[PDB]
């Protein structure tokens, strides 16, 4: 057979694309954990993991497989609901939030003019997943990291939501693809540099990364909510924190560094002229290039997640809630009344072309 097998592929083709998409995200997340220790290792004059697989390539494999084969500790044998439900919400939200990220023009699973709302809505479901982990527990350390966890995520959600809305206001579109294409002539890091610092600061808090680390602070509250997590509930929750790191690093690339747009249009043009547009080999190269530009921009921020962790001491929680309210929020509302003013003054109010 050859004719009754081709249509089989055409009936399964769009499932292979999704698996290639999910594998694409998980490979980045899996090797983000290694890159965090490999990078933070070399800034501390260490080496980091280089013994598990040649040069430590199989380090995420060992850590995941080690925990996937640990004894799950349930309060009573049939309490799998309590342990898993917390991390499961967190993992689904951040895996569903990947559905709007485009790897090129139009290459996103969900394309709709409400992509920005879908992205902020999905993240807020993950916030609900985080606080549930401790709220079903009697351990004092685990239940400690709910009231402080709840407000930290609540407080820096306003700042992250408003920043996204200012960029959406400059293009007058809540579509991810339109925002990226709107940055052809200029990258929004040049006009809105302060928002990028505010976006990156807020992004750290939302993922509970240091220096906004007070939730899962080893010296303060041990593993935080994870001091009661082991085996699979630990990995799923740990994976969620690194899906968010990859996502929020990609989102900073999209909103301020042009997304998949090339660093040089000339180099992009010269490279693609070596392939014929009438053969599928041209489109693989463009897709590799366009995701390559995003990957390099995204990698720089996954680097900065680790880089700031190796350079800044952890910030005290009481001084952390007052930072986003008494410093960041007035600035963010000041700009949201500033950008419409400048645009109107020069008759440059945006329209979705």
């Amino acid at each position: 057979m050859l004719n009754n097998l081709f249509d089989f592929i055409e009936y399964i083709e769009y499932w292979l694309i999704i698996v290639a998409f999910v594998a694409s995200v998980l490979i980045v997340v899996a090797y983000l954990t290694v890159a965090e220790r490999k990078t933070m290792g070399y800034m501390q004059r260490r080496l980091g993991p280089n013994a598990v697989g040649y040069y430590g390539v199989l380090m995420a494999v060992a850590d995941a497989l080690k925990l996937l084969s640990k004894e799950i500790v349930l309060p009573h044998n049939g309490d799998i609901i309590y342990v898993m439900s917390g991390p499961l919400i967190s993992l689904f939200s951040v895996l569903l939030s990947w559905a709007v990220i485009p790897f090129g023009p139009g290459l996103s699973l969900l394309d709709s003019e409400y992509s920005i709302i879908y992205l902020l809505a999905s993240g807020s479901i993950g916030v609900f997943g985080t606080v549930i982990v401790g709220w079903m527990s009697n351990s004092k350390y685990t239940v400690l990291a709910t009231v402080r966890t709840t407000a930290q995520l609540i407080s820096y959600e306003l700042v992250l939501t408003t920043v996204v809305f200012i960029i959406a206001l400059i293009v007058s579109s809540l579509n991810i693809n339109v925002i990226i294409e709107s940055q052809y002539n200029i990258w929004y890091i040049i006009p809105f540099f302060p928002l990028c610092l505010i976006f990156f600061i807020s992004a750290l808090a939302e993922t509970a990364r240091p220096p906004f680390d007070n939730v899962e602070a080893e010296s303060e509250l041990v593993s935080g909510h994870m001091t009661e997590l082991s085996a699979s509930p630990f990995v799923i929750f740990f994976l969620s924190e690194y899906c968010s790191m990859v996502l929020m690093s990609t989102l900073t690339a999209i909103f301020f560094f042009g997304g998949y747009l090339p660093f040089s249009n000339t180099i992009h043009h010269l490279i693609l002229n070596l392939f014929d547009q009438h053969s599928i080999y041209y489109f693989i190269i463009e897709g590799i290039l366009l995701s390559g530009y995003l990957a390099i921009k995204a990698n720089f921020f996954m680097f900065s997640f680790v880089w700031i962790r190796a350079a800044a001491p952890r910030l005290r929680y009481d001084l952390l809630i007052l930072f986003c309210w008494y410093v960041l929020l007035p600035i963010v509302f000041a700009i949201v009344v500033f950008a419409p003013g400048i645009l109107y003054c020069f008759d440059a109010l945006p329209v979705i072309i």
Binding site: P105, E113, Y184, H268, N273, H278
Partner: protein
Amino acid sequence: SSTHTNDSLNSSNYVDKLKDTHFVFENDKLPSEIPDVEEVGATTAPLLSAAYFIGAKCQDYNDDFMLCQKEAKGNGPIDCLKEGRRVTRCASGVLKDLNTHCSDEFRLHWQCLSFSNLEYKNCRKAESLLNKCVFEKMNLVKKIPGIPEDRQIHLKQNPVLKPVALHQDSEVAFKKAQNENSI
């Protein structure tokens, strides 16, 4: 705008299951009392490519077709059936001309539109060749009403927003005209 409606195809088959949508056909053709017209067969991309030449050639009939809708006072579909066939015949006239005068210039342009998300900003090199050809062989021009001639967008020599990726057939055809024509 991707809002769900009761009038066309929706986003997903899960919308159809909730609405219990039936996609209903009607075999009955039009009665013989209404003289037949040959419907336009062009798809989306060719129409967007020839839209400004349909506007230049069928301007009187399009205005008259609409003025019949304005003055029909709600009975527009029934009382403008004869004036609605002139527009269909006029537009078929233009697409038939482009196929018999500028077949390669036309096809190159709407292949570019099918390659660049159906956006006019991405296909200026192919579009400029098509406009120049149409002018000499049919006298049609592209004009955007409401602005001075010097400030039309498609004549902008250095546009701010440019295509990310080039159309190979457009760039190859353009430089050939830089030798054939720019003598």
